[PDB]
Design an enzyme around this catalytic site. Structure first.
Site, short mmCIF file in Angstrom:
data_model
loop_
_atom_site.label_atom_id
_atom_site.label_comp_id
_atom_site.label_asym_id
_atom_site.label_seq_id
_atom_site.Cartn_x
_atom_site.Cartn_y
_atom_site.Cartn_z
CE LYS A 246 -0.42 0.12 5.07
NZ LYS A 246 -1.28 -0.26 6.24
N1 LIG Z 1 1.24 -8.40 -1.53
C1 LIG Z 1 0.24 -8.88 -0.78
N2 LIG Z 1 -0.42 -9.98 -1.20
C2 LIG Z 1 -1.41 -10.47 -0.44
N3 LIG Z 1 -1.88 -10.01 0.72
C3 LIG Z 1 -1.21 -8.91 1.11
C4 LIG Z 1 -0.16 -8.30 0.44
N4 LIG Z 1 0.29 -7.19 1.14
C5 LIG Z 1 -0.49 -7.15 2.19
N5 LIG Z 1 -1.42 -8.15 2.23
C6 LIG Z 1 -2.45 -8.37 3.25
O1 LIG Z 1 -3.30 -7.24 3.26
C7 LIG Z 1 -3.67 -6.90 4.63
C8 LIG Z 1 -3.20 -5.50 4.94
O2 LIG Z 1 -1.79 -5.48 5.17
P1 LIG Z 1 -1.01 -4.10 5.37
O3 LIG Z 1 -1.93 -3.10 5.98
O4 LIG Z 1 0.30 -4.39 6.01
O5 LIG Z 1 -0.72 -3.58 3.86
P2 LIG Z 1 0.76 -3.67 3.18
O6 LIG Z 1 0.57 -3.41 1.73
O7 LIG Z 1 1.42 -4.92 3.62
O8 LIG Z 1 1.54 -2.38 3.78
P3 LIG Z 1 3.06 -2.48 4.37
O9 LIG Z 1 4.05 -2.48 3.22
O10 LIG Z 1 3.32 -1.27 5.26
O11 LIG Z 1 3.23 -3.75 5.18
C9 LIG Z 1 -3.09 -8.02 5.50
O12 LIG Z 1 -4.06 -9.05 5.66
C10 LIG Z 1 -1.90 -8.50 4.67
O13 LIG Z 1 -1.49 -9.83 4.94
#
Ligand SMILES: Nc1ncnc2c1ncn2[C@@H]1O[C@H](COP(=O)(O)OP(=O)(O)OP(=O)(O)O)[C@@H](O)[C@H]1O
Ligand SMILES: N[C@@H](CCC(=O)O)C(=O)O
Ligand SMILES: [Mg+2]
Length: 468
Positions: A246
């Site tokens: 994100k």
């Molecule tokens: N690339 C991805 N593929 C699948 N699920 C994901 C992925 N990135 C995050 N998620 C899932 O989405 C949800 C939100 O995660 P989170 O808020 O950490 O977003 P993020 O993109 O991982 O941000 P950050 O890089 O700061 O960790 C969680 O359930 C996490 O496991």
């Protein structure tokens, strides 16, 4: 009976990753005639954003998913928000202390940093504080955390249904904090306590959680509970194979919705991220996905989430899956948002039909066809120069158009054809300038179809303005 769940930790926007994981949990549950529940893991009091939970639930429904137990629908094993069960985690943490599977640790952050630099992580030295002394220090109000007492030395075996068994040396597993100094639980404690109490039998989550599983297996063992089946889905990846985040790209489901992506298309695309149909079809319904679902066809490699491919599928849904009437209905919210109205349903339907082959997202319709709903349409720099170049041709053309009684696509086309020959120029030299005058663009659908759509009088009105 199979019982699956999603345990989103709301932060801000509903994450596409949550939809992806929810999709497979929903499919596995439905395929087995089981249940799919939603648990909100909202104990992070620093990342709490009012309305974030509601946006996640709304996005799941928007995507065509439905759940059987949750914060808004209720259920037999609630509360469904971890913020509403804080006392449970504390009582279970106390149970672990009683069993000798956990201990209170009083180190300050400064001490932990020193220990980490010396040992490479916390070394469990607090395990050597006499239990009764630890309880007294706790009773006296000394700040502390409760950590898992990993068996040292030892090994922990964990089975992932898709990857197989992994034997971990306990030395790879830290004495993780289970209960923080503020009385709040860490993910490991709350996740295991709640999956157990909610009767979750099949845990399906992103592979980034895979390494946390040995800790969970130790907790289930500690409580004397049966561990569920674990399935770790591949993380969604960027073209460069890095994990989608994100902080680096558009992961907000609300962004996709606002950009005009159809829920059925986004859902269909997410299906293709961790699964493939036996026959290879890329376009299918949620029902078909469920009927054909099997872990045997779930790839473990990193799936690339390609925005261009998503746009392609969206476009295919807009012109080959949905009906003209369905598309016209769906573009309405976007028209209104763009401050545009439509004279009639018949007109709108016609506008959509002409533009259908030219837009891949619902939002692009009002943007590329603005000139069909208002006189206040923008004129591109390129269109303006082209209009200027052909102004003298258009001026001489104006009279012919005003006298034209048959205002049809075929009639107008013949008129411009004759005029072009008369002036010794190719049809396009007359058509391009005219398109610019009537639409403020050089890229539109059939010029003649657009020329007659608005009617003679309104068409002449715009030519007049460009000649004024
Ligand atoms: N690339 C991805 N593929 C699948 N699920 C994901 C992925 N990135 C995050 N998620 C899932 O989405 C949800 C939100 O995660 P989170 O808020 O950490 O977003 P993020 O993109 O991982 O941000 P950050 O890089 O700061 O960790 C969680 O359930 C996490 O496991
Ligand atoms: N709340 C965790 C749940 C992880 C799990 O599925 O155990 C997350 O953000 O996904
Ligand atoms: Mg993350």
């Amino acid at each position: 009976m199979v019982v699956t769940r999603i345990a989103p930790s709301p932060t801000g926007d509903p994450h596409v990753g949550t939809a992806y994981i929810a999709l497979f949990n929903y499919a596995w549950a439905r395929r087995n005639g089981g249940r799919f529940i939603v648990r909100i893991e909202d104990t992070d009091r620093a990342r709490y954003v009012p309305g974030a939970e509601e946006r996640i639930l709304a996005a799941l429904k928007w995507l065509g998913l439905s759940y059987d137990e949750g914060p808004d629908v209720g259920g037999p094993h609630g509360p469904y928000r971890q913020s509403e069960r804080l006392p449970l985690y504390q009582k279970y943490a106390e149970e672990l202390l009683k069993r000798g599977w956990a201990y209170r640790a009083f180190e300050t952050p400064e001490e932990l940093e020193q220990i980490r630099k010396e040992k490479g992580g916390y070394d469990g030295r607090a395990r050597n504080i006499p239990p009764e002394e630890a309880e007294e220090r706790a009773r006296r109000g000394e700040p502390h955390v409760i950590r898992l007492k990993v068996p040292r030395p030892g090994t922990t075996e964990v089975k992932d249904e898709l990857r197989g068994v992994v034997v971990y040396d306990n030395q790879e597993i830290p004495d993780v904090v289970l209960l923080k100094s503020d009385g709040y639980p860490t993910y490991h404690l709350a996740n295991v306590v709640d999956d157990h109490l909610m009767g979750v039998t099949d845990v399906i989550r992103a592979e980034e959680w895979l390494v946390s599983t040995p800790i969970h297996v130790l907790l289930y063992r500690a409580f004397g509970w049966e561990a569920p089946r674990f399935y770790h889905m591949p993380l969604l990846r960027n073209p460069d194979k890095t994990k989608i985040s994100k902080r680096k790209s558009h992961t907000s489901l609300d962004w996709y919705k606002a950009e005009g992506f159809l829920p059925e298309a986004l859902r269909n695309y997410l299906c293709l991220m961790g699964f493939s149909m036996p026959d290879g079809r890329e376009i299918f319904t949620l029902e078909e996905f469920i009927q054909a679902f099997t872990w045997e066809r779930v790839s473990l490699g990193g799936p690339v989430f390609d925005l261009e491919k998503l746009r392609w599928m969206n476009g295919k849904y807009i012109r080959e899956v949905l009906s003209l009437e369905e598309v016209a209905e769906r573009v309405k919210p976007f028209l209104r948002e763009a401050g545009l109205s439509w004279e009639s349903e018949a007109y709108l339907r016609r506008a959509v039909e002409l533009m259908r082959p030219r837009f891949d997202t619902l939002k692009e319709f009002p943007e590329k066809a603005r000139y069909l709903f208002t006189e206040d349409y923008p004129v591109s720099e390129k269109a303006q120069r082209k209009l200027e170049e052909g102004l003298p041709l258009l001026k001489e053309l104006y009279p012919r158009l005003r006298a034209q009684e048959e205002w049809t696509e075929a009639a107008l086309e013949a008129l411009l054809r004759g005029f072009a020959a008369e002036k010794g120029v190719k049809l396009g030299q007359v058509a391009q300038p005219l398109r610019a005058a009537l639409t403020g663009s050089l890229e539109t659908p059939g010029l003649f179809e657009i020329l007659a759509l608005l009617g003679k009088e309104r068409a002449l009105r715009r030519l007049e303005r460009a000649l004024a």
